[PDB]
């Protein structure tokens, strides 16, 4: 095996990256990386359109919730399981999507926007933080309040050299289960001195307190590692780049021609270029034909190309940077060159699967956990009422009675028509249902069917033609 | 090295050289060094 | 025969290869090859795209459970191998699905995320490690769980050598099979020296404790290697050309122009750059024309081109690393030339060959591995109970108890009509069944007939008209 | 004929091989030929390609068993005939796919793995081994266990020279036929040296206990040729050539410019490029016009096209490397320029036919040896039961009662609607039956008439339609 | 000095004008409307007067 050896000719006698753990690669770099980071995001028109792209893709406007408890498992019967869902879907309609904003502390997201905050956190950070409280002196009906830590406030230990089971401030028992978190105080005015609390993972009484939400890599991962430390360093280059090539570019531009004489400067730019001494301006009006002398001498300087080949160039590194972030290139680039409808499609698939994956995973994980919290105070507080001769308790089937599914925003058909045509030989068929064809356009059946309900009701009444739905 | 053997322990070979009386040898040939990577572990006495 | 010889005209001299196992060829170097693959995953854009397509592609976003019993064998009847298949399944995925994430010990994963993690910790280390404890304490319905250990942990305990009957921290019989494992600890701190720790394969009983997954090239081999060994070299020089490169075009595009005078330093710059004493910062505003003494002059100097043929390098070592990978070329470059319909399906398919290998093998058998572990303590604790009029017990025949079948997630199709038009062709015709049409999207037959024998009654009861599937 | 003459010009004057047999141009350098086509193979982005490409299109993801008796030339009754076929095949699919992989001693293979790793052997070495035994000690129904023998292993005891009836570790009896193979033991790193031991090829009772596929050249091969032969040199070459390439890439690029004075080293450095002396760093910051005098002079280097014609000779090389293993250039080289679709269909059929051969010689001899093997243990251990009234018995035709047809992976047609029509049509007319159509999709028809008659009492059971194959 | 400089390429400059019209253009459009709709089961009213209202 050539891959462990010397090398060809010797050329990779030098490279012998040490054999570490993920942990002893990532922590003592981890606060300079994520800096690092924001510092592209926030300075980077590339890196800013892919986290857009990110959050408008993978969340979309809007992420609804369909409730599924397994009435099987639990032997509730099929219609009491379907009226509870019906009650906890209206609860959580009217706490989640409120205009006052009351489900965040901090009063300024509502639950859409903490979707897509978290994905965004869990884009450039590789974490999200959810933290949920109480708030006992509030009049309102639910006093379940969920807030977003950023993860730079979940410091470590205060920095100093760790240990074993304490671990980038994230207590760690024997396995690696964690128990407890450290949080910070973010101090805008930088004199206050800092202060650090202890907040336990769960409660003891089985409810989830604080939230965390990564994906590991390794066997061991206490803090998980963002998606930028593939690029980041071709992307700083780029950025130098780009600008060095627009100052090159002006400086070449801005030097027009090139006077050579013997005369004074005062003399020879007034019976050359055309100045009037009456440094000195040259009018722009007409055009000249000066006069010279043996000794003077005028030259019109020529400049290379402009962008020589650095389009290109572009090209190949920004393929590069798209290839290590996870979008397509057109998204990225905003090129979209010359392409048939079969490429198109190809790009547009090679990128769904993607963004399905990370929806699959940490907004449906954290919309999941965080209506779970809301769902146990719901029930303690008799706004919703369980079935009875339930064979579990709420507290010893926690994902049954609540196990949910989130539908997000669907694609957008790049043909308008054979999508169309697509969902309706489907469906002529029995090869696929009502639900998933009308989920793939991000709307909930039953909906639909009530709206069309009303509308063969509406549309006799009124007095005019039955609709195509209604049955005879 | 033509039949691909290189830092092993006993090679074996045998060739017969050509000629009007052709003789058949054998051959077994090695490298053998012994070590201790921790020289005092061992105490030797004579007894008496 | 020429490839035995010296060659051509004795070119061939002195590539003379040993001749050895995979054990003499990979032994010696794992740690530093699997140390360089680790770098080229976490620092290189390409490679960490390539995992992305290989966790995205083989698994998906959901990897479902089919139980399909060998009830012939056994004697005990259709009807109770179905009722006893789907008693099994609703106990799985309600198991294994659990908000709280409670079938790892780390509570970190859910068992996608798990299979996924093992696909891709093959891919770059070349075999993948699970392990099957219990946590006595706990008081849930399944004690069992699962933990994930990294291939560095195996090693021989205090890093001796490796003797005839231990290589590589695996323990090995008289025959080639495996008797235990060593682990190491996880040491996250350079101190705190490390325990080694003894852990069999298989419990007395049979029952699977420690798994091991990978697949043998030759006769003996005690541990794999990884898919990198073939491109570790061009990838590690390509980021290096890359790299200089692009340091190389900023410097050539850097130097805009280039002063010759004869005064001080200072004044030259006053005199024919136009920057001010009060080097000098020059304010880019406007065009300008100098006036130069004989003794003077100016250069703008001119760069080669910046991209020149360095795509189509960029090109052909993509290809040499995609060919060498597995994934296509298009997949892993994102170039997306201009191309037919043709070419890119012949594409799509000549990778989804490799992809539909990997998850029959890699992901198909750790499943299966789990889930038996998992379903002997089903049957033990009597959660769920056997068909009675057995001809064999569980323990004398696991596999045939435990058979299963797992479904990914379906490809996404170039066009879209033309699948499903196939699709339709296919099940008008008796070439193909339901079953396996619903399988190539990742649905179970059985919950959509569910689902259209409730929405046919909800159509009905709501006065709308009945749908295509509906019965007369 | 100039043929076998001087030639042309007498070019051709020393161009004499020798007029010798296969046996007498191989063996004297087999090992090393061996050895390199391992070094090709585990050092090379294209020839693990190769590999794969045998390895996936060859067999696949599964390779099923179709037993056939020849009942008419025995004597045995239709019935009887397919209730032996029916018994046989379970007990077949329950001893060849169990997923605790027993089926060979070392426990890391399925039958499937075993099957393509005979293919992968005898495509890179030429020859491929398999050894049946018994275990004793397994208290399992079946005792037969088989291994793999790595073609290095078995070679002439203790490298004694080579003789008449031993040919390099085969002998030989008086005819051409062999009678047994000397096989040694490998340990790596040491212990007592290799032990030669005798393996007869078949046991006295005429079972098959050493399993030897390779394909014959001439008269007389005693020991396999491998594939690669025909183009090792041209794969070593394009090797070297590639990375001298990519290293001269490297080191043009690397100087960007250059600085002629005559200062100090670091005062030209400090004046010119502008770098600080508070060798000396240069910042790549904004833009710069360096001040000289008549001495100095800067210079901007320009180097040659990175890729000067190096990509279309690769191709050329690719071509004749891919003619000389067997898969075609766009397989290999993962090009796939602007093609028609009837090039790509073309192209298609050129590897189909050949792996088509090669799946119907090799893997299909290994396998039905295999299941011979494995048939003897049944009807012998009664866990099948012989037809009554048999001409002959099972020793006297062991080909009579295990005559079987295996079934691979099919081929992904570039156009899915077409192939789809193309099966309907031929279906309509009377010129194919279905076992054809279901047997080119990889697909056992039985199985899917079962599966229809199924699904068509689930459908009446739920409500549904009649699907389309029902009869009225 | 951050709002200061972006109000200072809006007000000067064509491409970041053009951008000012193209959202208002496409996010809001040429008129603005409004559509009611109560959620009468959890207040548990009606659906008439829910309408009417």
Redesign the interface.
Known sequence: ?????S???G??RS?????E?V???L?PNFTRGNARADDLVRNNGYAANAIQLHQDHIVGSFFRLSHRP?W??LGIGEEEARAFSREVE?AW??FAEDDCCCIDVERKRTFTMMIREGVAMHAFNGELFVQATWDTSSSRLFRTQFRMVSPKRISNPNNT????NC?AGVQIND????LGYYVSEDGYPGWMPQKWTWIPRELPGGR?SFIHV????????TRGANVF???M??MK??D??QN??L??A???A?????????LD?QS??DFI?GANSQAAP?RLGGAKVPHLMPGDSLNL????DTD???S??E???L??????L?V??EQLSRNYA??????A???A??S???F??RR??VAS?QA??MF?CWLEEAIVRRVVTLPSKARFSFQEA???W??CDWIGSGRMAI?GL??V??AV????????????ECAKRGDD?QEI?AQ??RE?MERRAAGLKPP????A | QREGINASARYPKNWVTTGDPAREFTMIQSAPLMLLADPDEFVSVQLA
């Open positions: 095996y050539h891959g462990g050896g090398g060809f000719g050329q990779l490279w012998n990256p040490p054999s753990s942990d002893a690669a922590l397994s099987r498992y209206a309609k009217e050299g760790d240990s074993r671990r396995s690696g289960a964690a989830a990564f994906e590991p890599v390794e066997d061991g991962q430390y593939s690029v360093e071709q280059m780029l130098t780049l060095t090539q100052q090159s002006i400086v070449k801005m030097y027009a021609a090139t006077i050579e004489s013997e400067t020879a730019m270029l040259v300087q020529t400049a290379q020589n080949g650095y290109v160039f090209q190949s590194l393929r590069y940077i798209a290839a290590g996870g397509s290139y010359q392409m048939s409808y079969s490429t499609r190809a790009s698939n090679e769904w699967a993607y399905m994956g699959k995973f994980r999941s956990q779970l926690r994902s049954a609540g196990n043909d054979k999508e045509q697509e030989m489907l469906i002529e068929a029995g090869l696929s249902t009502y639900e998933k059946y069917f069309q309900v063969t195509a739905w209604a049955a």
